[PDB]
Amino acid sequence: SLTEENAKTFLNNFNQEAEDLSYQSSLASWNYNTNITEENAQKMSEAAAKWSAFYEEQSKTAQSFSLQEIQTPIIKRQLQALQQSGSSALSADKNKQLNTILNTMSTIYSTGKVCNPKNPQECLLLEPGLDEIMATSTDYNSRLWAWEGWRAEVGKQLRPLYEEYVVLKNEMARANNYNDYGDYWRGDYEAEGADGYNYNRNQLIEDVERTFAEIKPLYEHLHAYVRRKLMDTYPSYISPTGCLPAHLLGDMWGRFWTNLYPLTVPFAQKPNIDVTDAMMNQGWDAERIFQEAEKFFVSVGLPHMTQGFWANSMLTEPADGRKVVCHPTAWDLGHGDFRIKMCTKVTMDNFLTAHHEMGHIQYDMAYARQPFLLRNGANEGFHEAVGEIMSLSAATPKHLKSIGLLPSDFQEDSETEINFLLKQALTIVGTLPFTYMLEKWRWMVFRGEIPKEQWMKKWWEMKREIVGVVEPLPHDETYCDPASLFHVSNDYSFIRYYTRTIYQFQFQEALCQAAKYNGSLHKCDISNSTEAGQKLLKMLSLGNSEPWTKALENVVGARNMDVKPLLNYFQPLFDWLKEQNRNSFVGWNTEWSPY
Amino acid sequence: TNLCPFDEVFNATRFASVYAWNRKRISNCVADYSVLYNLAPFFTFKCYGVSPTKLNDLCFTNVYADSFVIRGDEVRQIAPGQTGNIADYNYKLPDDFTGCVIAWNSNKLDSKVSGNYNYLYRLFRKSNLKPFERDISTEIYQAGNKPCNGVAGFNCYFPLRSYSFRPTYGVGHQPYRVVVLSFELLHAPATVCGP
Ligand SMILES: *[C@@H]1O[C@H](CO)[C@@H](O)[C@H](O)[C@H]1NC(C)=O
Ligand SMILES: [Zn+2]
């Protein structure tokens, strides 16, 4: 009769057909990613085309119901989730222009080689043959050559394309009652309708600057330690007061400092125990790795794995005849179907990847009671933060000594703890300033605070003052350095990696205080604890039916990002850095330059 | 010994939809519920009004055997005093229901790799079904306040939908064959006694 009953019937008729069309496309995508041939790639196209056509046809009609006479929150949330047409607000021609512009940057980033000032018959592309120079090569005049040649060849043609990509995306978002495209990406954290749990959009800015301003001393100490450790291999190219060069890090862009461990190590005589040489002398398999991971989740209060999982999942590489994309993923086909595609080897890195991949299955298996529009995570950082604590718990020496992998003779030591905390330091704390700086630059560019003739003028001073990284060679206003990243040449939000880290430690501290633990945070696990693990299942049952500020309150108790489990996780490391950074200068100045 | 008319409703070859459930009459025979153990591993023999634990020695004047097919997550709706989609639009049981329900998984027979679009159910209806009522109409369900004129446009949908079973679904979506026996106790000579 009224708008409420009409909307209820409309949503029922939608959910009836949507959950059957969204199954054939996912099944075709699975069959293609597992048995890629000349026919599966063509069969995967029509299913997705029909699904997209149905989705647009249903979203174009789900707009006559005014969202003003709706008093129930569930129907209102489903209508709000169905009213986001995305890029369907642009015109007919502008759509094709934006489609052909985005593909050009993608094929430019995919292809493209580099030439050296030496004999030029060696043409290197982004194939792992090139990034090895930026990962394991220590000799100078090669890392700098590669770093300059990358932004020299493929960085020049991405400038005339990004200038139109910015103005085109600013018009697509202007039709969705937004301000710009930077405000469009910030809308995922918009939670409306609650008693006190209301979260505004713009607050997302004020909550990040307040958060990054608290990990500045720890990052400064780590940066000073890395700078002092790098002066033993490059004595004449590093200044003990200035910043670090843009190259010479452990990555092509400096996003992850993980490749600096063989150089920046506290104690080199320590073995850094590995359980890889423990399944050879006793006998393991790819099924035993996924069986010891299932036993982990049933000792906490989580359901078993369905019979269709062990029969339809690809847990190893095929023998012959087939070919796979070789990427561990967890597929939620729908209709009660859950699979995992991952080529598993008998190692330690694959033993911890099974837990991270099953952390997504236990999340998908748990919100399946939602009307097909609330079957997601709270926000973009909630889904990937659940799989991180499962790998954090399964890597402790306590969990490895309770399954038969580590003998009951070696307990712990103060040196291996520091060796482990530093390797984890240059994987989490080393990427937060980079992520913050990149997202801030992209937001200011999409807004308008940075003119078109000031991009590579404010891109580098921020990297000098925020990240503490200087450029080796000057870059005039014809380059495009951020566009060299994969997440910038293709439309991808980069802030999802900043919050996911914080949520990673807010969940771990709240789930380790429900198992009666008193030691260090980096030594606790949620195994054999039903209480610590039943509070998590309460949050993993809402999807996006409730505001993310309320689902976070059910597991940790707080309504916002309050990051000081991270300062408690790296407590034995932050105290060891202050004892070493004594006869040095903690900090940098944005005035020095190598050349 | 005139044995029961069973072995023709259980071991059938073609079941019926839930919105057009089949009904069979049983009279002038001998009830022999002692061979149902050889059937599927089914975990549903749920009886109300009578006792199943070795209390099959009563005499009835008539027996009504209904049969249909549903999904695995709706077998809980075939019970006295229940709500949902099937219980309100397809098959309703009274609160004084004397008799019982059996449900067994039929994934190996009623599922297809391309989708079993044969079985149907009812999704929309103006009102709920009376106990043991049945509707087979295919009229356009007018939701709004404008006429439909026989065409299904906006706020005017078709009331019948399909199941599309597949062997890769979960246990909550795999097909289940359901048989409901109801016992009548009239003032007539009870000719259905059983050993
Ligand atoms: C159906 O077939 C099975 C097969 O063993 C048999 O035992 C049973 O008596 C038959 N009839 C019924 C009603 O189950
Ligand atoms: Zn993951």
Residue numbers in the entry:
A (entry chain A): 19 to 613
B (entry chain B): 333 to 527
The authors write:
The Omicron variant of SARS-CoV-2 carries multiple unusual mutations, particularly in the receptor-binding domain (RBD) of the spike (S) protein. There are 15 amino acid (AA) substitutions in the receptor binding domain (RBD) of the S protein, nine of which are located at the binding interface of the SARS-CoV-2 RBD and human ACE2 (hACE2) receptor, namely K417N, G446S, S477N, E484A, Q493R, G496S, Q498R, N501Y, and Y505H. Receptor binding is the key step for SARS-CoV-2 infection. Omicron BA.1 was found to display a broader host range than the prototype, whereas the Delta variant showed no alteration.
Compared with hACE2, eight substitutions were observed at the mACE2 interface: Q24 (human)/N24 (mouse), D30/N30, K31/N31, H34/Q34, L79/T79, M82/S82, Y83/F83 and K353/H353. Structural analysis showed no significant changes in the molecular contacts of N24/Q24 and N30/D30, whereas N31 of mACE2 was found to form an H-bond with R493; however, a repulsive interaction existed between K31 of hACE2 and R493. In addition, F486 formed a π-π stack with both F28 and F83 of mACE2. RBD, whereas Q34 of mACE2 formed an H-bond with R493. Both F83 of mACE2 and Y83 of hACE2 were found to be involved in hydrophobic patch formation. However, T79 and S82 of mACE2 were not implicated, while L79 and M82 of hACE2 were. While K353 of ACE2 is a conserved residue among the 27 ACE2 orthologs tested, K353 is substituted by H353 in mouse and rat ACE2s, which enhances the binding of mACE2 to the Omicron BA. RBD via an additional H-bond with Y501 of the RBD. Although neither G496 of the prototype RBD nor S496 formed H-bonds with mACE2, the relatively longer side chain of S496 shortened its distance to D38 of mACE2 and formed additional van der Waals force contacts compared to G496 of the prototype RBD. Q493R, G496S, Q498R, or N501Y substitutions in the prototype RBD independently confer binding capacity to mACE2. Notably, a synergetic effect was observed for the four substitutions, where individual substitution only resulted in weak binding (1.3 μM–44.8 μM), but which enabled strong binding when coordinated, with a KD of 16 nM.
